[PDB]
């Protein structure tokens with residue numbers, strides 16, 4: 001299985017970090033991103049370097065770096081990260097926003113909220129409000145108070161996080177979450193649905209469900225061609241993307257409230 005790291009441009013320049021790690025015996029390979037590297041060899045556990053501890057990078061699959069790139073938040077945006085822990089994608093969104101605007105990062109589990117806050121503090125992120133709550137109830141609070149967002153990441157839990165039952169259970173949850181995400185989007189706003197599963201029940205089923213359920217949503221077409229070097233192709237709904245082995249299994253789509 002491949003290992004990659006995302007360089008945290010909040011704190012450090014790609015080439016400064018690259019030189020420092022290569023001088024300690026790390027062998028790094030380019031990526032379709034100037035701030036992400038493939039780790040080819042490491043005398044270090046990569047979550048264990050002083051550089052990691054300083055917030056210089058985040059280890060993560062390259063697949064998992066796509067949803068924030070596709071959502072493409074701007075600097076001053078107001079952003080919801082619906083299912084946020086451990087914060088891989090929350091800190092990615094913050095880096096893309098350069099620590100401007102606001103991310104509301106929501107996490108159901110109390111324990112996982114710990115890991116989320118740790119990642120955020122470690123990566124030096126300042127634009128993020130951590131909510132420990134069930135999104136399905138937290139959204140009434142947001143709706144009552146008219147708190148709509150410019151762009152939303154729904155990076156949903158997946159069957160793999162933990163059978164046919166696992167998949168059916170996750171799919172149902174994902175369908176609940178996405179309807180909620182559309183409800184919380186400003187008119188003309190953008191939601192990315194992603195998940196660590198390439199199973200169609202968690203993928204195009206959830207997309208087909210929301211398109212038939214609602215009249216106020218439009219599929220935005222995403223293209224693979226940008227994502228060089230990644231085993232990524234079009235889903236079975238045009239303009240959706242599925243990532244395959246030997247990349248980490250993943251699915252990404254993008255919607256617009258009309």
Ligand SMILES: Nc1ncnc2c1ncn2[C@@H]1O[C@H](C[C@@H](N)CC[C@H](N)C(=O)O)[C@@H](O)[C@H]1O
Pocket residue numbers: 064082083084085086087088089090106107108109112133134135136155156157158161196
């Ligand atoms: N209703 C819910 N509200 C908030 N968080 C949830 C809810 N249901 C599941 N989750 C969380 O969804 C997360 C699943 C992860 N795949 C998210 C990864 C995260 N987006 C990252 O990039 O690092 C877990 O943290 C679950 O605790």
